[PDB]
Design a binder for this molecule. Sequence first.
Ligand code: TCL
Ligand code: CL
Ligand code: CL
Ligand code: CL
Ligand code: CL
Ligand code: NA
Lengths: 323, 311
Amino acid sequence: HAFVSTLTRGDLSSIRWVCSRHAQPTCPGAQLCTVYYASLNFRDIMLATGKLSPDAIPGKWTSQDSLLGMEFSGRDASGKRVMGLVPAKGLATSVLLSPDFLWDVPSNWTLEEAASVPVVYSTAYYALVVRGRVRPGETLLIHSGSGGVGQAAIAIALSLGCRVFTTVGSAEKRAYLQARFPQLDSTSFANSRSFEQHVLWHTGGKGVDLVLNSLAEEKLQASVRCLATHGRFLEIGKFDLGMAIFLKNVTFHGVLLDAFFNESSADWREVWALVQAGIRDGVVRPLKCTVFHGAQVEDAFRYMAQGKHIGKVVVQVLAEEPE
Amino acid sequence: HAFVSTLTRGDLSSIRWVCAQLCTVYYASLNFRDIMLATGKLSPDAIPGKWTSQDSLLGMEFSGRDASGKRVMGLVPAKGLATSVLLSPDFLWDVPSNWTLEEAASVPVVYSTAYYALVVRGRVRPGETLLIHSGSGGVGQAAIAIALSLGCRVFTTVGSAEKRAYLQARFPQLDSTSFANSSFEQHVLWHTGGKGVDLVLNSLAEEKLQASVRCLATHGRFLEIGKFDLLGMAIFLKNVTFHGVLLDAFFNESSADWREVWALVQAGIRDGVVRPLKCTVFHGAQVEDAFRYMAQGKHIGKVVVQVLAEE
Ligand SMILES: Oc1cc(Cl)ccc1Oc1ccc(Cl)cc1Cl
Ligand SMILES: [Cl-]
Ligand SMILES: [Cl-]
Ligand SMILES: [Cl-]
Ligand SMILES: [Cl-]
Ligand code: NA
């Protein structure tokens, strides 16, 4: 067994593979999977650079545990291709996890790209459907549309018949989204020319019903101004109060999946089912992947941290075998 | 027709009387917003709706009689502190026989607010637990009444022993464990088995947000009533939902949504859940005294201005 860990806490240059046989659990509640690809998420960057303490992550961890890695694709003990969510420790040669957090990988998918799906789509479905309760014909404002969760949210929003507005960091990102999502038109892109004025003008002065991730971009105040009454804010936890909030009867939803691995495990399969149905119906599409050899894991992190990429940064722990 | 107005904006000493369904106002209650307006801490431009510079917005609720003489109580978007109000019948309730008009004037705002916050927004369920800050406050008392009627366990913080004593006497269903600050987070955590509470009401007003999060259950909800005189990772890890609440929208763009709240209040009256607050009454001529006393915030229940004595 081997996992990725920073030698000295907070130093990304000290990152390396620590090597060392984990037993197969008999009980149906736990399962040992072989990791082929492990995706990087922003939290992994926060942990490795020391901006985030592992003591902050919920669960039962020891002082020697490395929590790097939140999602993977690979094979179960029987050799079936799977992808899954893990509370931590995804960046390893094998993962021990509950089968409740596994999905089968569609035959037309590569293992490589399947690794990009679990976190962003589980997060987007939980936020929009379970928490946001999106309804057809409602309007959404998705900040950072080309970002991982943004892309998932756009795909889900459009599938449920919702009208989508988004903000993006660049023309390239705008161009990418327009091509990936032909249902979008030029009016969908709110920050190409302020975004709140744009939204108001294309919502009959009424504003949008839901806003996703305004805090990450520091666009909350502006977002309230183009929010409809009884609007809902959806904000995914990132480890880094005007009167309008009350007059408009605004609701704020703080969102993270960590609880589903713990005290909220009884409510997880609702989210699991949403992802599964989305896969079946073609809504859930793998993101674009930039792949690094596991031996270049440090390079993957530094590349990820720059945040200039589109899609997912994936680490190849074990190359998928030829068919 | 006459209404209360500050002749000079922001000078409470200059306050005086100035000489859909039309109702005669017998009693007009004061709310903190009225104080904010009268003392100039709040601009009338901040209050939604179509008002003119000549309007006085003082007064949010009343009791009296409609045109046909039937005793009523109601919510108004503004202009409640007057000899008459013009309003949609959607914002009127019949006054029960056992109530005086005096005390009926204490009901509309706090119970409409409490029902909308706890039931419509909070979606409180039987067997869930609530932390109600400032339990002796108007909305707090309404919230406690509603929570107990729905089979919820109530925790509350109070400013003094008198307030506890009043609440304990007003609500015999409460016990010693209901009063969390006789630290509340430690008290709450111990009496919820470390699970925390499902709902918290008005932590911001009391400056108890951080501590309230610490004794909040996963998927817990914060309910916060707007006040014009106003983020750890736990917020996200616990999947917290925050509800900002005010009734103003119901008079305007959310009029279609109002009936649910109206019916909740009416039903609460029917089931005897809705009980009038204690009232401290001032004659209309001492309207200034009423404002200054209200501003002291030492009272328990409602401050009410008698515009016209009940026959
Ligand atoms: O004070 C808060 C308390 C909680 Cl539990 C959650 C969010 C809070 O602050 C907010 C409330 C509403 C909106 Cl739309 C945005 C923000 Cl940042
Ligand atoms: Cl993070
Ligand atoms: Cl599309
Ligand atoms: Cl005014
Ligand atoms: Cl009682
Ligand atoms: Na106020």
